[PDB]
Design a protein around this ligand. Structure first.
Ligand SMILES: Nc1ncnc2c1ncn2[C@@H]1O[C@H](COP(=O)(O)OP(=O)(O)OP(=O)(O)O)[C@@H](O)[C@H]1O
Ligand SMILES: Nc1ncnc2c1ncn2[C@@H]1O[C@H](COP(=O)(O)OP(=O)(O)OP(=O)(O)O)[C@@H](O)[C@H]1O
Ligand SMILES: Nc1ncnc2c1ncn2[C@@H]1O[C@H](COP(=O)(O)OP(=O)(O)OP(=O)(O)O)[C@@H](O)[C@H]1O
Ligand SMILES: Nc1ncnc2c1ncn2[C@@H]1O[C@H](COP(=O)(O)OP(=O)(O)O)[C@@H](O)[C@H]1O
Ligand SMILES: [Mg+2]
Ligand SMILES: [Mg+2]
Ligand SMILES: [Mg+2]
Ligand SMILES: [Mg+2]
Lengths: 107, 62, 240, 253, 242, 244, 380, 385
């Protein structure tokens, strides 16, 4: 951060003249201990309605992890968000919405 | 929390009366006991009627 | 639990490491001893199903401790290498100091003493090998059969089996052998040990190894063709 | 790969269309099927493709059971998932749970995912009918066999397993060929060269080559590709795949 | 831990409690002392007919005038037996005097009355906590025939009759009143068999039980399996009349 | 089961199969492939290198191959760090024996003693097992050319041919399939190069990725001559076998 | 082959039609309860149905202001009055009232609260068990006699010593110790009433509804004389707090709290004994365990060898056994464990004998049953 | 085969005969409307305007009034008028009340809930006894606890021993545990209740404990019975975690069932089949013998067992008589009975790829390679060291 990733997308937001959906990783991680899987589905649907749309997810460094802990109940929703995102992306090809854009510290 | 009888609808209101009664007919020492059920230092602190008992606690002292 | 301690005596009275030793004996090869009036027959599995194995330099499971003292074993091959070495040294020690050739019975005790010692000394595992030590006493021509256990004790049986599928072998040993009378002839005795081993090997010339030890330093391992001859004769009976 | 197509055809199409033929000529009926092999092979695609032609109702069923709120929690209404699928024969329940998640719980036996899943698996034979005819195949998809949820690992009812390799150069030639035909054909017909020279690693890899070669014609403001472009496009796509994947290692061995 | 550095909240030591269980599960052993010899009987707990029963022994000649039966843990018992033999032989070399039974019980118990790894003005050779008791029987000139119950726990207790192991609660209850000092050596043998008969589920024969005595005259004398067998026959006979 | 206990060698797993030993397998297999083929007219040792950087000088490192003495050479796969103690002891032990009887060490001896230290660290001492596998290539006149492998556990088994470290299974399926029973020494080199090219990422099997040695009884007047081939003689023979 | 395929195909259709034909069978015939002479009742019933005095909407006085201020259960307040003539002294805070649908006047005062009726279903009266056939010779059995019987039978001695009468006992032991069994035995012998409360059953919650039930039940007890109130399984709900959790919960703190305060400080009691059944004291909130709630705690001690021969004998009497069978020998081989383990051993010994085709169980059978149970417990 | 044909002939003449009889028999002209019926009918229509809003009878006061709670938050002090006896009504009964004025017009309910119907699954067990290829010895442990008191009460009565309460099935899946469960069920012909334990895991307030009570009521009503609490461990030892609202529910449900399994005493007339994978490495929640009595561990199939299972399967196959059966089972190590089932299914699938309608002599020796290799990978046993 300081490489102005978000800044780039602020530029494109004006010029597109068309939807811009700016969301954060916070929204996705639990809000009822169950809200998280639902919340993945709604951003993709909402994009279709007001297409063209730019899907921008600011944080995903903490949603995407190689390993997980299923012993914490709250974590299970983190795991489920990651797996549904992979699935939806394959069904999201050949749409007017741009395929998911995300910003990270690291690849 | 003991004077909360059944629902926290009809009882949150009961408590606002109890506060009113207790201040009136001074001098008095009101002994309020265990505070643990309405303490709720947590973030999942109820915004229900449990807030109302608790707030009227701050009012008494102020 | 108490598997992390040896010093800790345990109110269960049973230290888990000791239990775990037994799991280890089971896994190993089946090794059997059956004794006549004039012989110990030791029938044992040696696996040889391994592809690209030069069989010549692969160690036979039976190892000469002494000139007339032999050992077969069930349980982990690595752990077993320590018993064989201590026991060999002590063999020659015996002669060096008593002059007397190896008393087998001393030797049974010496070996068990090591599996015992290590149960008391923390930071030393109990071995998960059970063995058969068999031999013939100084100035004697009566066969001698012993088993040791990882519980750090020893016992003598008229015939005994250890290792994988020992349950199966034990029924045979009850019905075809007797403490009261061992098969008087060497020949009888060898043929039954082949039939026992067949129950778990299920047909193999080199998978079955027979070493007969006689008195007075007579060690000879049966010829593959002769072993093959026991099998065919037995196999004719099976369909009758 | 078509290796794959014959192997999957036998398993799903014949018992769904006519259980009566399958049963008699063979013995028993096939159960669930587990697709394993790397990401980016296009396993999902296969599952969609069979359902298209058979006319199985591809119901994508999210691993989550909390995304279902409609008639209550989908954990508690396990039984409704069964009853309704049976009516809705022919059907493919694509129960996406990759099982990369829950690294701890593979070797464990705790966790909410383990609880719900094991009852679900038992329910199919207690209610009956999916036993009688496996017109509803429960397609699981995962990267490996060794990462499975502990309920599915042990015997139970999973039996059929189909292994997908990452493409060979032959298979790569096929995938590359057909996308190029739809798009703009590789001129000098050196799409065969490109596949012979090197292997990618996925069919996902191959669609990336397709996009880039075409983007190179766009920069010139041309609308047709040539061999020169594929030769640039391949080196860029494929090399990038290697530099992102190697960085994790320090200098061990 | 729960070692011996940990003092139990109880006022005990955890290892000491743990030692008792091993004696409880141990082999059933009976001793009844007279002033004409002490007779000890054990169950050799024969389990299979391929087991050689004779070979196995849980009554062992420790010294000329002393023998011991063992109850507790089979492992610990090796070490314990070697200690005892040595302790006796050292004194005989050193002063060339027959020792008391009392003197022997103490010395065996000398290694016993310390537990831990820590030592502070002493040596260590231990590495645990041992849990094995013995019946230590013998004869000394001074006080005649003596029977001791050597414990791996508190100070040794002298006994006139004692039974330990798994058959203990019954066996001991019988003993309090059946014991007397007026018994002959012949009366006393049959009385040991009697208790043994009751507390052993399987029927009594000479292939699973062995009798032995310490009388000064014949030293530690292991009964012939013929000598044992007849008295079993005698036992059944008097019970028929009775 | 759940609570995996393995702090010490002495402390048992419930399973009874010490996890520290299990982890040792993983490690061996981490390292690349090494392969010993014993032939009737020599032994051939051929392996793909661990290292892969061109900056790092692959050429001067024969990480896999060290000679312990004039007749005995060992190929090494596993933990480099741990390994370094054992290679060194083995040389001194060999020279200790030659001191005593003024004869070359028998192959069988030299393995059994080293295996026994490996056991020593589980038998007593918290000290980790030194998880390393060597393939020993040796000659003695007791049995001729002898090949051994050693398990981290501390046991050995002879072999007609064996593979260690990574992709043991694949190299093993190929060797047994085309195995020529007698085995000529020329043949073994050809056969080895074929197996490595299929398991090695470079399918052109560059020389700079190759370590090679041949120990030959086919050396004049019937004697045992160890020859470490340098990267420049590997390259010349690469063009002889035609993979490049 | 083929002509016999079509025999299967026919069979299936038939079986399905028979099952639907059941509905047709049931028919349309309607008949309702009230036989013999309660359909002649219905003829009276008809004119009174058209008649009006039923229903009465039920509400509850929340204050008497010399008219009355009533509060209905839908939550809505009215000032009302007396109907035919309803004395002032009858209507009290908490007293239910019958009022008319819409003319809103008191007819009958109705007994306070409908909540006792709900909870009186759970309540069970003076259970009976004979103390002699109570297994073991347990020390615990004796301390129960001190708590319960002796203050009821002879309150005089307690006054004289100038000790407080014991009234609280906390029962805890592994499952199968006989906590329920001994409490029922001393209920019978002392000849005192009994109130069954099960705390595991409390689920009626509105933030403190569980607290209403508990105050009423304990109060029911005070009214009663020579009684026992046995709250069963207070391991959870009025047992452990669920505050510890991330989101947490405190409907259980309401229930818990109420009970503590009824016990703690002045409050009359009509010789109320307090029995608490927890499987483990650990689960029990420490607040309750530490004193000034329950007076006494006894850790159940597993039956002695004499007590274990004693339970076995109880079972052996029920059984048909061999003559000269050694009860004591069987018992000694057996672990020091609950009366439960011993119940099971007699159960399996019975069965192996039946299988073996015997009507009298041998000594040998119980050697087998023992070997079975040891292994079970161990392996887990 | 043939035995089955003999039965078809009888079953198809029974149905036909019944169906025809039924018209007349039910009525179609019989039309009872004589004085006793007519009475009931006339009255019932008059009194009952509909809809009828049900209540629960909380208490009786003897003066033919009752106090009931209706579904409305106001309760109603009602008259008892007409029909149902005063005696017959006991508190806790659910009741029909008339909508114009609330009066007790009868009962026909008995606290009927849809939950009981769902649970109720007496329906045709798919298993008969010994269709299964399992071993006589395993099934004749379940049978000993469950069957044997119902078939022969003489021996149990005479001994004086109590009839056993419960068994626990645990294995090892692919030992056909639920097959075993429905083998037992067929023989007894008992009301066979089934409930799955995950329906008792919910965030919903207090619902778990309510469900637990229902189960004991249901079994007792429909006694003699077998209650299959399938995946008992779902409630118990098995988890759904407590950072998901589980810090409330799971505790309350576990305790509740536990408390009712002991009860004031073991019922001793409700048999249970408790399923769980194994409680060896899991915590035990099935609280000691005498309430679960004999506990049944199914062996992993040995060589002789799988012979019997194998014989079923080979019957349909043609060209497996030349194939030596004995050698296929031996060569494979001892493994699940499921793996022999898997093999048969794969075998047919594989014949089709060769293009042979049913298995070739060769196909069967080949079949073994694909199934053994797949299964050993799936489940890896400790390697001998
Ligand atoms: N063979 C193919 N032909 C066409 N496109 C392909 C092919 N394979 C993969 N792709 C492309 O790659 C995208 C992503 O691959 P997909 O998610 O279907 O992979 P998968 O191997 O089933 O993985 P996961 O591990 O996520 O379950 C597809 O949506 C498609 O556009
Ligand atoms: N004792 C047994 N009783 C019944 N079938 C058995 C037995 N042992 C082995 N099996 C074999 O295992 C096959 C499959 O059992 P199935 O997998 O349905 O059983 P389960 O143990 O109830 O498990 P799950 O529900 O987890 O699949 C049976 O059809 C049969 O071939
Ligand atoms: N004193 C005893 N004599 C004989 N059997 C006994 C004795 N005590 C309990 N049991 C047996 O133990 C079992 C359960 O007894 P009880 O119902 O009193 O248990 P508890 O300790 O109160 O358990 P829970 O934890 O389930 O509330 C029964 O099988 C009973 O016969
Ligand atoms: N093109 C640029 N000109 C000026 N400053 C820049 C430029 N790009 C990035 N920055 C700096 O980078 C910082 C971060 O920008 P921002 O869009 O908030 O994103 P992030 O921290 O997520 O990359 C700002 O302080 C901004 O000044
Ligand atoms: Mg940012
Ligand atoms: Mg996919
Ligand atoms: Mg109880
Ligand atoms: Mg099942």
């Amino acid at each position: 951060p300081g490489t102005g990733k978000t800044m780039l997308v602020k530029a494109v937001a004006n010029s597109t003249k068309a939807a811009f959906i700016r969301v954060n990783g916070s929204e996705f991680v639990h809000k009822y201990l169950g809200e998280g899987p639902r919340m993945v589905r709604d951003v993709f649907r909402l994009a279709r309605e007001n297409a063209p749309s730019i899907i921008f997810i600011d944080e995903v460094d903490s949603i995407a992890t190689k390993r997980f802990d299923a012993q914490t109940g709250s974590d299970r929703e983190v795991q489920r968000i990651l797996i549904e995102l992979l699935t939806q992306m394959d069904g999201f090809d050949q749409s007017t919405n741009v395929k998911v854009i995300m910003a990270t510290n690291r690849a | 929390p003991q004077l909360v009888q059944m629902y926290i609808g009809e009882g949150a209101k009961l408590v606002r009366d109890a506060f009113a009664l207790a201040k009136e007919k001074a001098p008095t020492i009101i002994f309020i006991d265990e505070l643990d059920a309405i303490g709720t230092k947590r973030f999942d602190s109820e915004k229900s009627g449990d807030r109302e008992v608790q707030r009227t606690m701050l009012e008494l002292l102020n | 639990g108490y598997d992390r301690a040896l010093s800790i005596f345990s109110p269960d009275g049973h230290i888990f490491q000791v239990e775990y030793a037994l799991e280890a004996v089971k896994r190993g090869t089946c090794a059997v001893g059956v004794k006549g009036k004039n012989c110990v027959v030791l029938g044992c599995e040696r696996r040889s199903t391994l592809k690209l194995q030069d069989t010549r330099i692969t160690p036979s499971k039976v190892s000469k401790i002494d000139s007339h003292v032999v050992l077969s074993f069930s349980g982990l091959n690595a752990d077993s290498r320590i018993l064989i070495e201590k026991a060999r040294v002590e063999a020659q020690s015996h002669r060096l100091t008593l002059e007397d050739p190896v008393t087998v019975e001393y030797l049974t005790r010496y070996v068990a003493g090591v599996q015992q010692r290590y149960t008391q000394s923390g930071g030393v595992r109990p071995f998960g090998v059970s063995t058969l030590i068999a031999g013939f006493d100084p100035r004697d021509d009566e066969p001698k059969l012993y088993q040791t256990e990882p519980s750090g004790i020893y016992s003598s049986w008229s015939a005994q089996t250890i290792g994988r599928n020992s349950k199966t072998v034990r029924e045979f040993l009850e019905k075809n052998y007797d403490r009261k009378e061992p098969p008087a002839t060497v020949e009888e005795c060898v043929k039954l040990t082949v039939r026992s081993l067949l129950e778990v090997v299920q047909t193999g010339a080199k998978n079955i190894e027979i070493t007969v030890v006689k008195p007075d330093s007579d060690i000879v391992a049966l010829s593959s063709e002769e072993i093959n001859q026991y099998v065919t004769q037995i196999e004719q009976e099976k369909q009758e | 790969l078509t290796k794959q197509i014959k192997e999957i055809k036998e398993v799903i199409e014949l018992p769904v269309k006519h259980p009566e033929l399958f049963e008699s000529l063979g013995i028993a009926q096939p159960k669930g099927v587990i697709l394993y092999g790397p990401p980016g092979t296009g396993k999902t695609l296969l599952a969609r493709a069979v359902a298209h032609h058979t006319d199985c109702k591809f119901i994508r069923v999210s691993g989550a059971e909390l995304v279902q709120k409609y008639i209550g929690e989908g954990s508690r209404m396990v039984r409704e998932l069964f009853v309704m699928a049976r009516e809705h024969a022919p059907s493919i329940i694509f129960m996406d749970e990759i099982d990369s998640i829950g690294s701890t719980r593979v070797e464990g036996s705790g966790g909410g995912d383990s609880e719900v899943q094991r009852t679900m698996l038992e329910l199919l034979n207690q209610l009956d009918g999916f036993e009688t005819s496996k017109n509803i195949k429960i397609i699981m998809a995962t990267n490996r066999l060794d990462i499975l949820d502990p309920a599915l690992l042990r015997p139970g009812r999973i039996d059929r397993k189909i292994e997908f390799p990452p493409p060979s150069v032959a298979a790569r030639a096929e995938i590359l060929r057909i996308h190029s035909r739809k798009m703009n054909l590789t001129r000098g017909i050196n799409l065969r060269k490109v596949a012979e020279k090197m292997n990618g690693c996925s069919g996902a890899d191959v669609k990336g080559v397709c996009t880039e070669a075409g983007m190179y014609a766009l920069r010139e403001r041309r609308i047709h590709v040539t061999q020169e472009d594929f030769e640039l496009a391949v080196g860029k796509v494929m090399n990038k795949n290697q530099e992102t994947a190697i960085s994790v290692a320090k200098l061990f061995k | 831990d729960r070692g011996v550095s940990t003092f139990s909240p109880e006022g005990r030591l955890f290892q000491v409690e743990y030692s008792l269980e091993a004696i409880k599960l141990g082999s059933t052993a009976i001793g009844i002392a007279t002033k004409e010899g002490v007779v000890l009987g054990v169950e050799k707990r024969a389990t299979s007919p391929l087991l050689e029963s004779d070979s196995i022994e849980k009554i062992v000649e420790i010294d000329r005038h002393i023998g011991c039966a063992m109850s507790g843990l089979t492992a610990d018992a090796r070490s314990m037996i070697e200690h005892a033999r040595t302790a006796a032989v050292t004194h005989n070399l050193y002063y060339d005097e027959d020792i008391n039974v009392e003197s022997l019980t103490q010395s065996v118990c000398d290694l016993a009355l310390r537990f831990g790894e820590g030592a502070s003005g002493e040596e260590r050779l231990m590495s645990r906590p041992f849990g094995v008791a013995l019946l230590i029987a013998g004869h000394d000139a001074d006080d005649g025939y003596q029977l001791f119950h050597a414990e791996p726990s508190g100070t040794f207790y002298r006994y006139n009759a004692k039974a330990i192991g798994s058959g203990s609660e019954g066996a001991q209850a019988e003993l309090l009143n059946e014991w007397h000092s007026s018994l002959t050596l012949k009366e006393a043998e049959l009385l040991v068999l009697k208790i043994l008969k009751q507390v052993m589920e399987e029927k009594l024969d000479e292939n699973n039980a062995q009798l032995s005595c310490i009388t000064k005259q014949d030293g530690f004398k292991i009964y012939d399996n013929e000598k044992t067998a007849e008295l079993i026959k005698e036992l059944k006979e008097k019970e028929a009349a009775e | 089961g759940s609570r995996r206990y393995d702090s010490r060698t002495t402390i048992f797993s419930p399973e009874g199969r010490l996890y520290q030993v299990e982890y040792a397998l993983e490690s061996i297999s981490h390292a690349g492939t090494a392969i010993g083929i014993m032939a009737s007219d020599g032994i051939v040792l051929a392996a793909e290198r661990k290292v892969t950087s061109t900056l790092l000088e692959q050429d001067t490192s024969t990480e896999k191959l060290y000679k312990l003495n004039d007749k005995i050479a060992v190929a090494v796969a596993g933990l480099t760090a741990d390994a370094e103690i054992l290679i060194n002891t083995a040389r001194i032990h060999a020279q200790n024996y030659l001191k005593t009887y003024n004869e070359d060490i028998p192959v069988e001896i030299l393995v059994r003693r080293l295996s026994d230290i490996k056991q020593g660290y589980t038998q007593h001492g918290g000290l980790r097992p030194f998880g390393v596998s060597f393939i020993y290539a040796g000659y003695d006149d007791r049995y001729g050319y002898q090949l051994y492998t050693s398990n981290p556990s501390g046991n050995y088994t002879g072999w007609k041919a064996i593979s260690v470290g990574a992709n043991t299974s694949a190299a093993q399926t190929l060797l047994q399939m085309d195995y020529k029973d007698d085995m000529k020494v020329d043949d073994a080199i050809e056969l080895a190069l074929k197996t490595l090219s299929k398991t090695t990422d470079s399918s052109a099997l560059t020389y700079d990725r190759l370590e090679f040695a041949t120990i030959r009884k086919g050396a004049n007047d019937g004697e045992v001559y160890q020859k470490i081939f340098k990267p420049q003689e590997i390259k010349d023979i690469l063009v002889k076998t035609g993979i490049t | 082959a083929a002509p016999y395929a079509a025999k299967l195909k026919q069979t299936e259709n038939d079986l399905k039609d028979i099952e639907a034909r059941i509905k047709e069978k049931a028919g349309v015939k309607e008949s309702d309860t009230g036989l013999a002479p309660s359909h002649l009742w219905d003829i009276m019933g008809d004119r009174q149905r058209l008649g009006e005095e039923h229903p009465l909407q039920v509400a509850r006085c929340t204050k008497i202001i010399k008219k009355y201020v009533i509060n209905l259960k839908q939550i809505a307040k009215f000032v009302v009055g007396l109907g035919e003539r309803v004395s002032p002294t009858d209507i009290e805070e908490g007293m239910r009232v019958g009022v008319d649908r819409s003319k809103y006047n008191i007819e009958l005062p109705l007994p306070p609260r409908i909540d006792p009726s709900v909870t009186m279903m759970t309540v069970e009266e003076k259970p009976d068990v004979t103390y002699s056939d109570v297994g073991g010779c347990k020390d615990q059995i004796e301390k129960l006699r001190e708590v319960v019987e002796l203050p009821l039978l002879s309150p005089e001695r307690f006054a004289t010593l100038g000790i407080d009468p014991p009234k609280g006992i906390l029962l805890y032991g592994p499952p199968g110790t006989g906590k329920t069994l001994c409490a029922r035995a001393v209920a019978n012998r002392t000849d005192a009433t009994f109130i069954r409360v099960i705390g595991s059953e409390l689920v009626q919650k509105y933030v403190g509804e569980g607290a209403r039930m508990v105050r009423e039940l304990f109060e029911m007890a005070r009214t009663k004389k020579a009684c026992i109130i046995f709250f069963d399984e207070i391991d959870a709900v009025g047992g452990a707090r669920f505050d510890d959790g991330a989101g947490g919960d405190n409907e259980v703190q309401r229930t818990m709290l109420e009970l503590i305060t009824q016990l703690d400080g002045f409050d009359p009691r009509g010789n109320i004994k307090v029995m608490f059944a927890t499987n483990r004291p650990n689960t029990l909130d420490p607040a309750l365990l530490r004193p000034g709630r329950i007076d006494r705690k006894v850790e159940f001690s597993l039956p002695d060898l004499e007590g274990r021969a004693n339970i076995f004998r109880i079972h052996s009497k029920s059984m048909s056994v061999e003559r000269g069978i050694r009860w004591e020998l069987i018992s000694r081989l057996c672990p020091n464990s609950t009366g439960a383990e011993l119940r099971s051993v007699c159960t399996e010994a019975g069965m192996f004998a039946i299988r073996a085709r015997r009507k009298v169980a041998t000594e040998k059978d119980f050697l087998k049953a023992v070997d079975k149970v040891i292994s079970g417990y161990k392996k887990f | 085969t043939r035995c089955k044909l003999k039965l078809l002939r009888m079953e198809r003449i029974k149905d036909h005969l019944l169906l025809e009889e039924e018209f007349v028999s039910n009525s179609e002209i019989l039309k009872p409307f004589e004085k006793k019926q007519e009475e009931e009918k006339k009255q019932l229509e008059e009194i009952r305007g509909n809809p009828l809003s049900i209540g629960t009878l909380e208490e009786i006061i003897d003066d033919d009034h009752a106090i009931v709670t209706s579904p409305t938050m106001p309760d109603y002090y009602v008259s008892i008028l007409s029909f149902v006896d005063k005696e017959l009504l006991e508190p806790g009964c659910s009741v029909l009340l008339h909508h114009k004025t609330m009066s007790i017009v009868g009962v026909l309910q008995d606290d009927a809930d849809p939950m009981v119907s769902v649970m109720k699954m007496d329906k045709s067990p798919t298993e008969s006894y010994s269709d299964i290829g399992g071993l006589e010895s395993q099934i004749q442990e379940i049978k000993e606890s469950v069957e044997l008191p119902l078939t022969h009460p003489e021996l149990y009565e005479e001994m004086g021993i109590k009839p056993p309460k419960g068994v626990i099935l645990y294995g090892a899946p692919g030992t056909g545990k639920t097959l075993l469960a429905k083998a037992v069920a067929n023989q007894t012909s008992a009301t066979f209740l089934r409930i799955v334990g995950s329906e008792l895991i919910q965030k919903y307030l207090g619902d778990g404990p309510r469900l637990c009570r229902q189960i004991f009521k249901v079994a007792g009503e429909n006694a003699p019975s077998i209650v299959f609490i399938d995946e008992i461990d779902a409630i118990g030892t098995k988890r759904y975690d407590s950072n998901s609202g589980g810090e409330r529910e799971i505790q309350r449900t576990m305790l509740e069932l536990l408390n009712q399994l002991d009860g004031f005493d073991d019922r001793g007339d409700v048999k249970v089949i408790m399923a769980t994978n194994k409680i060896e490495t899991l915590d035990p929640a099935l609280i000691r013998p005498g309430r679960i009595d004999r506990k049944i561990l199914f062996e992993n199939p040995d060589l002789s067992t799988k012979k019997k299972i194998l014989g079923i399967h080979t019957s349909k196959m043609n060209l497996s008589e030349d194939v030596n059966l004995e050698t296929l089972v031996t060569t494979k190590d001892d493994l699940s009975g499921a793996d022999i089932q898997a093999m048969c299914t794969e075998a047919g699938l594989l014949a089709l790829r060769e293009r042979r309608m049913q298995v070739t002599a060769e196909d069967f020796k080949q079949a073994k390679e694909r199934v053994m290799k797949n299964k050993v990978e799936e489940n890896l046993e400790g390697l001998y060291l």
